[PDB]
Amino acid sequence: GMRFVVALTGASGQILGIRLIEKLTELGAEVYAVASRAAKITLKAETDYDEGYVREIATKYYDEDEIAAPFASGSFRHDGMAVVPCSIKTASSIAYGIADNLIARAADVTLKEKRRLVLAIREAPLHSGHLKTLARLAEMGAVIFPPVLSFYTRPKSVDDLIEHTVSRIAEQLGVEVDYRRWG
């Protein structure tokens, strides 16, 4: 019984976090989901998905102000956290300890207990301040995963690209996943 935290933050690519939650659920893991306010605004602008769809597919759902949620403490056990998509604001809050909501605090707790943390950073260009922040995060142990376009799987629709990226992110959580791979 593996349990994972998945957080959606206010960057483009809300569909990536929704699909990661669906895949991890499919594979029989529990997912504790958190969506920030900005992620809900982006979901509205970006998709037609029901505003309560994330709460629907998650094992348990928390809003970003639920700072007393169970995984706000390192004494609560789980197997890893993914922030997908991850804004610069959340990546930077984690990097520098500005743990002022449940998402940043849960990620900080993941890092201090040396559990796996995967950040699907979505921003471009990245300036030297961003890059130093990501380097600091990498030093702290986080997996830095820009959700880059990939074509070696020969994708034909947007869902093809989403599936490849979501699969590759799941592997960063230490998950055996079935998907097209390079041969």
Ligand X SMILES: Cc1cc2c3c(c1C)C(C)(C)CC=[N+]3c1c([nH]c(=O)[nH]c1=O)N2C[C@H](O)[C@H](O)[C@H](O)COP(=O)(O)O
Select the residue interacting with ligand X from 10, 17, 80, 147 (CB under 6 A).
10
Lookup: tokens for 58: 């998650």
Q: Is 87 annotated as a binding residue?
A: yes
Using CB under 6 A as the binding rule, whether residue 165 contacts ligand X is answered as no
Beta-carbon contacts of residue 136 (< 8 Å; ≥ 6 apart): 95, 96
Using CB under 8 A as the binding rule, whether residue 124 contacts a second copy is answered as yes
Q: Is 37 annotated as a binding residue?
A: no
The answer to whether the beta carbons of residues 25 and 19 sit under 8 Å apart is no
Angle of helix 14-26 relative to helix 37-46, nearest 10 degrees, comes to: 100
Q: Which is nearer to a second copy, 50 or 179 (CB)?
A: 179
Q: Is 154 annotated as a binding residue?
A: no
- Min dist CB 25 to a second copy, Å, is 22
Using CB under 6 A as the binding rule, whether residue 133 contacts ligand X is answered as no
Q: Contacts with a second copy: how many residues (CB under 8 A)? A: 85
Q: Is the dihedral of CA 172, 176, 179, 183 positive or negative?
A: positive
Using CB under 6 A as the binding rule, whether residue 94 contacts ligand X is answered as no
Any bridge partners for residue 16, and if so which? none
Q: What string marks each residue from 130 to 159 as x (binds a second copy by CB under 8 A) or -?
A: xxxxxxxxxxxx-xxxxxxxxxx-xxxxx-
The answer to whether the beta carbons of residues 62 and 32 sit under 8 Å apart is yes
* Contacts to ligand X from residues 39-78, by CB under 6 A: 39, 41-42, 45, 67-68, 72-73
3-class SS at 79? coil
- Min dist CB 28 to ligand X, Å, is 29
Neighbours of 37 (CB within 10 A): 13
The torsion angles phi and psi of 121, rounded to 5 degrees, stand at -60, 120
Q: Is 128 annotated as a binding residue?
A: no
- Min dist CB 83 to ligand X, Å, is 8
CA 24/CA 39 separation, integer angstroms: 20
Q: Would you tell me which residues interact with ligand X (CB under 6 A)?
A: 9-12, 36, 38-39, 41-42, 45, 67-68, 72-73, 87-90, 99-100, 105, 122-123, 152, 182
**Residue ranges of the binding site for dimethylallyl phosphate:** 152, 168
